[PDB]
């Protein structure tokens, strides 16, 4: 009893990762389904009476790095529900059917604390089509997950079961059945990529315009949201590389302020960054050759046959996340 | 005792025999194995004994566990919905007494129907399994399901599965009527739409439900339950997506209407008072919308192995 | 490890050690032997050690602040694409050239 709750006390997360629905770029449809399955039952509970019941399972799939876990963080901030984040490390115990006794205890906790959300990240590692798997882990963890999700005496009222995966075709057909809205999270289009550059530069001083972000978004076809987060990471390192490779700085303008300049210029003293006083440094603003430099160096992460099997599954069983 | 008596349910899920659509052979066998021994117990004397094992099999999502809920409502029995979580244990010699206790309390509570759901997770051919869990459970269960003449009240052992070909041949022997629950045909689908819309106000006719039932070939009953779920959401999309409502008709009542219409004020649902909202009707474009978006679940080679097992043993 | 899902509470409490003693460096030498594209591998080792390494590197409730995960390999094309994603600067160490050889 209390030994097991002592184990699973470290799953009720308590920190609210501050991602909001606008920090997600793109994805109208997936935000729409997640709002009308998470936000709307709590905010207007009088509506869901009679035949009108809320959704009790949502699978997100896609290529690597496109927004799945991030959108789960957005739900974790905006939901106002207890957000269990469980994984395969926390269910496979050593001890003859704890990997069923733990699962049953998990949903028993998420019924005593309803409304709840259970986010099983990378569900394809629990649920592996059961034609080649081993007896215990296979039949008993998969089977207790099945029976526990709908079953006979079980009452999945007010719990929601999310889940993300990258290999949606290696999923057992009974568990493809339990997830009743398989939404597909794709690589971003033009407007989404432009939005992600505008978000990821943040409030950093840059000389860029709307046509500059528009240019970069036109330049990066094939990149997922991870890749654009790291080209913005690398391009934000470019002023430091300037400010170290600077034989020679120069005063400009609140009391003294010097920036790197070429050998022999208007007020060009010869020094190193080390020579210069705390704060009173002026670092060259993000100017578009920094981003072109980063985009030349950084190369895509997803290939183009993985996309064929993703589109296969979307055409055979799936929604379209827009 | 107080560890397996969490198999008895008591909430009685209110599904009655006129909610499963079709499946008349299966209702027939279940009635003459559950209802009829209790109602006329004088008949079963001599050579005429009741059935003591029934396996339901089929593709995923076609009615097996649901029909078990129908039995659980209509039976007037004591109903043990036991599973593999509730029988296996660390300590050796506990997965002997647990099965043994289960059947002994079933004979405390005669008549008893016991629903060992997904029997392929207890009974796994014993050539690769571990010592404790696989062998003593399956041998003790084989013994206690060899109670032919003594179990004339009490134990009727149901069981459902999706992988009926991965079942041990001794346990294929014990289940003496392997019935197959298939994907549903036209009249059943039309019945399921008529049931799942419930008492919700809709403009649909019999030829509309007939149209949708003609449209959905290949869907199981789960899929039609979720296209009715999504199509019942479609009004709240036509209330959230609103720039303009309008009064119609018990004191004020407004519904979404197009920009510029007879009494078309411009507002949002948020602007409008509790209750005094007029929830839009259910069209047929709502169902066509849902059927375009929702895509079937069973794959057409799973059906080949199901038909294989039915042709060899079923 | 040997006893059934000990081979991933090791992964988890490795990274929890590096979080208690930050700023930390984790050097996983020869990473292609842990992380093998998971289309042919076995259930426990494959899905559970690879999966706990994935979720533990970025995940949801995990906070990879101040830890750095190195890693070397000789077969970089046999690496799973989610783990190719997690390693965000794949640098290539080539055979030497003239000034380097003279220096050596």
């Amino acid at each position: 009893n209390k030994k097991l709750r002592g184990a699973l006390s470290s799953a009720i997360l308590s920190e609210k990762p501050n991602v909001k629905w606008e920090d997600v770029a793109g994805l109208e449809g997936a935000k729409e389904a997640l709002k009308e399955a998470v936000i709307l039952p709590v905010k207007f509970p009088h509506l869901f009476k009679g035949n009108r019941k809320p959704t009790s399972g949502i699978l997100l799939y896609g290529p690597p790095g496109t927004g799945k876990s991030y959108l789960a963080k957005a739900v974790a901030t905006e939901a106002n529900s207890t957000f269990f984040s469980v994984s395969s490390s926390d269910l496979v115990s050593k001890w003859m059917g704890e990997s069923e006794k733990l699962v049953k205890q998990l949903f028993a906790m998420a019924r005593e604390n309803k409304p709840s959300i259970i986010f099983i990240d990378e569900v394809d590692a629990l649920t592996g089509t059961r034609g080649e798997g081993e007896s215990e882990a296979s039949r008993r963890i998969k089977t207790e997950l099945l029976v526990q999700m709908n079953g006979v005496g079980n009452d999945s009222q007010g719990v929601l079961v999310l889940g993300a995966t990258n290999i949606p075709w290696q999923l057992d057909s009974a568990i493809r059945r339990r997830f009743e809205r398989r939404i597909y999270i794709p690589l971003p289009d033009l407007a989404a990529r432009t939005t992600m550059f505008e978000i990821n530069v943040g409030d950093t001083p840059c000389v860029l315009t709307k046509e500059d972000y528009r240019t970069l978004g036109a330049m990066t076809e094939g990149y997922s949201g991870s890749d654009i987060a790291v080209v913005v990471k690398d391009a934000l390192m470019q002023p430091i590389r300037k400010i170290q490779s600077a034989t020679h700085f120069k005063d400009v303008s609140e009391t003294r302020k010097l920036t790197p300049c070429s050998p022999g210029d208007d007020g060009a003293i010869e020094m190193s960054w080390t020579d210069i006083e705390a704060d009173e440094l002026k670092e060259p603003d993000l100017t578009i050759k920094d981003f072109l430099k980063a985009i030349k160096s950084t190369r895509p992460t997803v290939n183009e046959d993985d996309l064929l099997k993703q589109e296969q599954f979307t055409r055979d069983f799936g929604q379209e996340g827009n | 005792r107080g560890a397996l008596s969490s198999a008895i349910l008591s909430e009685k899920p209110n599904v009655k025999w006129e909610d499963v659509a079709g499946l008349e052979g299966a209702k027939e066998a279940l009635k003459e194995a559950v209802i009829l021994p209790v109602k006329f117990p004088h008949l079963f004397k001599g050579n005429r004994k009741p059935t003591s094992g029934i396996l339901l099999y089929g593709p995923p999502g076609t009615g097996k566990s649901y029909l078990a809920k129908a039995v659980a409502t209509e039976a007037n029995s004591t109903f043990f919905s036991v599973s593999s979580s509730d029988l296996v244990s660390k300590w050796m010699g506990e997965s002997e007494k647990l099965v043994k206790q289960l059947f002994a309390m079933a004979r405390e509570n005669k008549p008893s129907i016991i629903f060992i759901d997904e029997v392929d997770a207890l009974t796994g051919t014993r050539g690769e399994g571990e010592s404790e869990a696989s062998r003593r459970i399956k041998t003790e269960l084989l013994v206690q399901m060899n109670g032919v003449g003594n179990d004339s009240q009490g134990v009727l052992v149901l069981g459902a599965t999706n992988i009926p070909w991965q079942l041990d041949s001794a346990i294929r022997r014990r289940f003496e009527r392997r019935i197959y629950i298939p994907l549903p045909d036209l009249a059943a689908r039309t019945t399921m739409f008529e049931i799942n819309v419930g008492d919700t106000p809709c403009v649909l006719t019999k030829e509309d439900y007939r149209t949708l039932g003609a449209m959905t070939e290949g869907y199981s009953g789960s899929d039609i339950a979720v296209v009715v779920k999504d199509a019942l959401m479609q009004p709240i999309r036509k209330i959230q997506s609103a720039t303009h409502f309008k009064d119609v008709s018990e004191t004020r009542k407004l519904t979404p209407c197009s920009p510029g219409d007879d009494g078309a004020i411009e507002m949002s649902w948020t602007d409008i008072e509790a209750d005094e909202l007029k929830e839009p009707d259910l069209t047929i474009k709502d169902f066509l919308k849902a059927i375009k978006s929702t895509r079937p679940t069973v794959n057409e080679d799973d059906l080949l192995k199901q038909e294989q097992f039915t042709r060899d043993f079923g | 490890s040997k006893w059934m899902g000990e081979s991933e509470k090791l992964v988890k409490q490795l990274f929890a050690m590096a979080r208690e003693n930050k700023p930390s460096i984790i050097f996983i030498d020869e990473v292609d032997a842990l992380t093998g594209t998971r289309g042919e591998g076995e259930s426990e080792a494959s899905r559970r050690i690879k999966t706990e390494l994935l979720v533990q590197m970025n995940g949801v409730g995990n906070d990879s602040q101040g830890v750095l995960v190195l890693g070397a390999t000789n077969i970089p094309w046999q690496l799973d694409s989610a783990i190719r994603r997690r390693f965000e600067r794949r640098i290539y160490i080539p055979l030497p050239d003239l000034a380097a050889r003279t220096t050596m």
């Binding site: 050593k94 001890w95 003859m96 215990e136 | 660390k90 300590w91 050796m92 571990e130 010592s131 404790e132 | 040997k2 006893w3 059934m4 426990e44």
Partner: peptide
């Protein structure tokens, strides 16, 4: 208690 090991 009878614990499970795991083989190759």
């Amino acid at each position: 208690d009878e614990i499970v090991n795991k083989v190759l």
